[PDB]
Amino acid sequence: YFGTLTQKAPNWYRCSSTRAKEEVVGHVTLNKEHPDMTIECVDDGGEFLPLEGARSSYPRVCHIDAKDQDDCERNRGFLTDYIPGAKQYWYKIEKVEQNGEQSVLYKFTVPWILLPPAKQRYKVGCRYPNHEYCFVEVTVEPTPPMVEGKRVTCGYSESGPVNLEVDLSKNANFIEIRCGEQHHPQPSTYTLQYCSGDSVDPQKCSPQSLTNIFYDYSSSWWKGKLNGPDGATLTIPPGGFPEEDKSFLVGCSLTVDGPPFCNVKVRVAGNPAAALV
C-alpha cells in the first residue's frame, strides 16, 4: 500500500497514490532555523495522515512506530503531547493545481519559542481511501536549556545530565524554574526538600530538608508547579536568607522517576554581603 514519496526541498515532501514497490519515508527536522515543513498530497481523484489531523481543534498525528495508514489512524495521538501549546492554526492549508495535477499542501510552522524541552518524534503524511499512504517522520528539536535573568528553563539530553546554576540573594530574591508540562519535578518533594547529593537522580539525590538552606523556611514560598505552564517560582523573604553563602539542588526528570535529568544548582547568597557587615 505504499504511495510514491519524493522530496521537493528540505522538509518538503510530495506523496501520490501511484503504488511504489518499496516503502520510502520522508524525514523532517524542525528547529529554530528550520521551523516549518510542507506535506504535499497529490489528489489522483489528497488527505493529510492522520485524516482530519491538520484541521481539527485538537491536532492529531501518527505514533512514530505506526506500521501503515490504519495503524496510524486507529492509534492517532495528540500533537500537544509532543509540542505543548500546539494549535491547529500552526497549519496553513492550500489547494494547488498544476498541469492537470491537483494536490493539497499542508505547511506546518512551530513558533520557535515553543519548541519543547526534549526532542520529540512523530509522523504524519498522506493517506487515501484505498488505504495507500506515505509517511513523513517529524523530529522536533528542543529549546536549549538556559538561564535568562532569574528564569531557568530546563532541558533534557540522552547524552548526559543538563546542569544549570542560578542565583538567589536578598535583593534578587526570586527564581523561576520550568521542567515543562511533559515532565516531572525532582525531588518530588521539592517544596520541602532538596538534593544534598550531586544529582537530582532519585538514586543519588539524598533528599534533605530545605530548613538547612533558609531561615523560617515555608513550602508556601513556592508558587506554581515545576511542570506547570509557567514553571514554579521560589521567592525568599529577606529574613529567609542565612548569613552564609549556600547552595541546593532541585530539578527535573524526563519521566516521573527516570532520565534524562536536569540539575538546577541554586546559589544562595549570605546576608549581609561582606561589604555591609
For the largest sheet, list the strands in their spatial order.
1-2-4-9-8
Give the proportion of residues in helices: under 10%
SSE string: EEEEEEHEEEEEEEEEEEEEEEE
- The tally of strands reads 22
Q: Report the principal-axis shape.
A: elongated
Beta strand %: 35-45%
| Tally of DSSP helical segments | 1
Question: What is the C-alpha radius of gyration, as a whole number of Å?
Answer: 24 Å
Keywords: Membrane, Transmembrane, Transmembrane helix
Protein name: Surface antigen
Disulfide bonds: 15-134, 41-126, 62-72, 154-262, 179-252, 195-205
Domain SRS: 12-140, 152-268
Describe this structure in words.
This is Surface antigen. Keywords: Membrane, Transmembrane, Transmembrane helix. The chain has 277 residues and is mostly beta strands. It folds into 2 domains: 1-143, no CATH class; 144-277, no CATH class. 2% of the residues lie in helices and 41% in strands. It is built from 1 helix and 22 strands. It has one helix at residues 69-74; strands at residues 4-9, 12-16, 26-30, 36-43, 47-49, 60-61, 77-78, 91-98, 101-109, 120-127, 133-140, 146-148, 151-153, 162-168, 174-178, 184-186, 193-195, 207-209, 222-223, 232-235, 246-253, 261-268. The strands form 6 sheets. A 5-stranded mixed beta sheet has the order 1-2-4-9-8, with no helix packed on it. A 5-stranded mixed beta sheet has the order 12-13-15-20-19, with no helix packed on it. It is elongated and about 85 Å long.
